[PDB]
Amino acid sequence: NFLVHSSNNFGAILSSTNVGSNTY
Amino acid sequence: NFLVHSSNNFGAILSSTNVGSNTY
Amino acid sequence: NFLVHSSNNFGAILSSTNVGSNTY
Amino acid sequence: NFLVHSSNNFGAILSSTNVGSNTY
Amino acid sequence: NFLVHSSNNFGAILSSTNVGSNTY
Amino acid sequence: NFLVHSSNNFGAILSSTNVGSNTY
Amino acid sequence: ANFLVHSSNNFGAILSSTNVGSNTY
Amino acid sequence: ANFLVHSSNNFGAILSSTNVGSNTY
Amino acid sequence: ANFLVHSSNNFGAILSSTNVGSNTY
Amino acid sequence: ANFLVHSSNNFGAILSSTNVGSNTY
Amino acid sequence: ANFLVHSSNNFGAILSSTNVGSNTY
Amino acid sequence: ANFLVHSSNNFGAILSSTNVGSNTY
Amino acid sequence: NFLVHSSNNFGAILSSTN
Amino acid sequence: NFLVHSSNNFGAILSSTN
Amino acid sequence: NFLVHSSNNFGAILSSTN
Amino acid sequence: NFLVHSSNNFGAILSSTN
Amino acid sequence: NFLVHSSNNFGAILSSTN
Amino acid sequence: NFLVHSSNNFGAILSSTN
Known part of the structure; x- marks a missing residue:
């Protein structure tokens, strides 16, 4: 199992x- | 199993x- | 199983x- | 199991x- | 099990x- | 088990x- | 009597x- | 009597x- | 009587x- | 009587x- | 009587x- | 009677x- | 005797x- | 005797x- | 005798x- | 005798x- | 005799x- | 006789x- 992840x-x-500004 | 992921x-x-601005 | 994913x-x-602005 | 992660x-x-600004 | 993590x-x-500014 | 972590x-x-500014 | 009222119950x-997310570029 | 009222119950x-997130660049 | 009222209960x-987060660059 | 009131209960x-966080650069 | 009131209960x-944190650079 | 009041109970x-923290550089 | 009177x-x- | 009177x-x- | 009187x-x- | 009177x-x- | 009187x-x- | 009177x-x- 050979796994390679690259992010450039x-x-x-x-x-x-x-997130928010809710009135209850 | 050889897996390669690339993101450039x-x-x-x-x-x-x-997200929000809901009045209850 | 050889799998390649590329995203450029x-x-x-x-x-x-x-998402929001709902009045209840 | 060979796993490589690269982030550049x-x-x-x-x-x-x-996050916040909610009135209760 | 060989694992490599690189972050540059x-x-x-x-x-x-x-985070905050909530009135209760 | 060989594990390498690098952060440059x-x-x-x-x-x-x-964090704060909450009124109760 | 002039009432301007916005009410939610x-x-x-x-x-x-x-x-929101999970986008690969 | 002039009432301007915003009320939520x-x-x-x-x-x-x-x-929000999980984006790979 | 002029009332300007914002009320939440x-x-x-x-x-x-x-x-929020979990982004890889 | 002029009332400007903001009330929360x-x-x-x-x-x-x-x-918030968990970002890899 | 002029009342400017901000009240929270x-x-x-x-x-x-x-x-907040856990970021790797 | 002019009241400017900020009250919290x-x-x-x-x-x-x-x-806050746990960042690796 | 139960009574409820409401206005506005x-x-x-x-x-x-x- | 139960009574509730409410205005505005x-x-x-x-x-x-x- | 129960009574509740409320205004504004x-x-x-x-x-x-x- | 229970009574509650509230204004404003x-x-x-x-x-x-x- | 219970009574509560409140104003403002x-x-x-x-x-x-x- | 219980009484509570409150103003402002x-x-x-x-x-x-x-």
């Missing part, structure tokens, strides 16, 4: 995450 | 995620 | 996701 | 995460 | 995390 | 974390 | 599961 | 699970 | 689980 | 679990 | 767990 | 656990 | 007699 | 008699 | 008799 | 009789 | 009789 | 009779 990133990455 | 990214990536 | 991206990617 | 990043990465 | 970063990384 | 960082890293 | 159990 | 159990 | 159990 | 048990 | 048990 | 048990 | 009710009025 | 109720009024 | 209620009024 | 209530009023 | 209540008023 | 209450008033 050369690009700018901008991520925004918002 | 050269492009700018912008992601926005919003 | 050279293009700008913009993604917006909104 | 050459791109600027900006991440913002906000 | 050459890019500036800025991360902001905010 | 050559990039500036700025991290900000805020 | 919930009496039922609510379950919500959300998954 | 919840009496039901609420469960929420959110997962 | 919760009487129900609430469970919330959030996971 | 909670009578229910609340559980919250948050995980 | 909590009568319920609250549990909170937060984890 | 808590009657419930509160548990909080926070972990 | 936007909230929740719950009355239980057992 | 935007909140929650709960009355229980056992 | 935006909060929560709970009355329990056992 | 934005908070929480709890009355329990056992 | 923004806090929490708790009355328990046993 | 922003705090917590607790009265217990046993």
